[PDB]
Structure formats: structure tokens, C-alpha cells
Design a protein around this ligand. Structure first.
Ligand code: HEM
Length: 184
């Protein structure tokens, strides 16, 4: 049903200080549920310290024109490129408007990172069981195409980039200040 993908391999020796800094924009995404067809834009600001990831998340539903903000927190695995987070809901000012529900979590794997590009996978869970997953190509620049190493990573697991939704064509609205001000 909502079974998460196998063969999701964390990058060996990810540079933590570089990846867990600044703002990342999703440029392409592939939701593994073919009926998940509402268009979205996504950006986030992940940070790490002492083996714990603390990240600010921004989603924008293009269909409904509604944005939502979250923060996620959880332990980084010993491989340094995978983490499982609990999350709450905040407003644009960072104030909590809905508390975390302990039964929900997500697991992010950083599959590849090169230059100003990255490829991540996220598995959403409820009570530790898979409910859905998605792959996303990230870039420091909203309108940029991915480094070839990201396509190589996709091809290693029989995915091709043309199958992904491209958001540069979408009418995205971003809250960049929410992310730039994260932990300031
Ligand atoms: C990159 C492309 C992404 C897309 C297109 C996307 C899309 C979505 C969609 C459709 C939902 C459900 C919204 C709803 O129920 O109305 C959602 C929820 C959520 N996503 Fe994503 N997502 C992306 C990336 C991520 C990433 C990378 C993370 C974590 C690092 C993440 C964390 C979450 C969380 C925590 C929720 C639940 C929010 C809540 O219940 O308040 N998403 N996303």
C-alpha cells in the first residue's frame, strides 16, 4: 500500500556542515503514490548539532494556494546521511500552532549531494509503519537543473528524471524569510 521504497542508500561520507546549512529548494519530486497529483512546492532549512537534526520545513499547495510550516527534530544515524524526526506545526513566525503527535514520524535519507544539488528520499510513518514515500531533487537555486551525479544516483535504482514533477513551471510562492531566519 504505502510501502516505502527499498534500495534507498545513504550517501557515504556526506559533508554534514555543508548539507545541514542554508536553504534547500525542491526542484523535482516523485511521489511514489501515482494518485498523489496535487502540485506542491517545498523548501527547507536543515541543521545538525551533536547528532540531532533540527529542521524548518515549508510546503506550498499550488492547487489550493495554502502553505504550511513545520519543524522536525530527531537523531542522525551513525552513517551521517539519514535521520528520523518527529514534527510539529508552526506559523510563519515560528510559533507552535499544533503540537507533535508522537505516533507520526518521517525518515529522510540523503542519497547523493554534489555541488549545489542533492537527492533525498523521505519515508513517512505512523506507529513505525510505512504510510508513503517520495524522492526529491534539491538545489540551492530554485531554477537550477541537477548535477549529473544526482541522475546517476537515480539511474542506479531504475528511476529517470523525466518521471518527476518539475516545479519551475508551477506558480510557486515561497516564504524564504521563515527559512533564512531559522535558528537565528
Ligand atoms: C520535496 C517535495 C515534497 C512534496 C511534493 C511533499 C508533499 C507533501 C504532501 C502532499 C503532504 C500532505 C499535505 C496534506 O496533507 O495536505 C505533505 C506533508 C508533509 N510533509 Fe512533505 N513533501 C515533500 C517533501 C518533504 C520533506 C523533504 C519532508 C521532511 C524533511 C516533508 C515533511 C512533511 C511533513 C512533516 C508533512 C505533514 C505535515 C503536517 O501534518 O502538518 N515533506 N508533504
Amino acid at each position: 500500500p504505502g510501502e516505502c521504497s527499498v534500495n534507498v542508500i545513504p550517501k557515504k561520507n556526506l559533508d554534514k556542515a555543508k548539507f545541514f546549512s542554508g536553504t534547500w529548494y525542491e526542484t523535482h519530486y516523485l511521489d511514489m503514490d501515482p494518485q498523489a497529483t496535487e502540485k506542491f512546492c517545498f523548501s527547507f532549512a536543515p541543521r545538525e548539532s551533536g547528532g540531532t537534526v533540527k529542521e524548518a520545513l515549508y510546503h506550498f499547495n499550488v492547487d489550493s494556494k495554502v502553505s504550511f510550516y513545520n519543524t522536525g527534530t530527531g537523531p542522525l544515524e551513525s552513517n551521517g546521511a539519514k535521520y528520523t524526526a518527529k514534527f510539529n506545526t508552526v506559523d510563519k513566525k515560528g510559533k507552535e500552532i499544533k503540537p507533535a503527535d508522537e505516533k507520526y514520524s518521517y525518515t529522510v535519507t540523503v542519497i547523493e549531494a554534489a555541488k549545489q544539488s542533492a537527492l533525498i528520499h523521505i519515508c513517512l510513518q505512523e506507529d513505525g509503519k510505512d504510510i508513503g514515500d517520495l524522492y526529491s531533487v534539491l538545489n540551492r537555486n530554485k531554477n537550477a537543473l541537477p548535477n549529473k551525479k544526482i541522475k546517476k544516483a537515480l539511474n542506479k535504482v531504475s528511476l529517470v528524471l523525466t518521471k518527476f514533477v518539475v516545479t519551475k513551471d508551477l506558480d510557486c510562492k515561497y516564504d524564504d524569510k521563515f527559512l533564512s531566519s531559522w535558528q537565528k
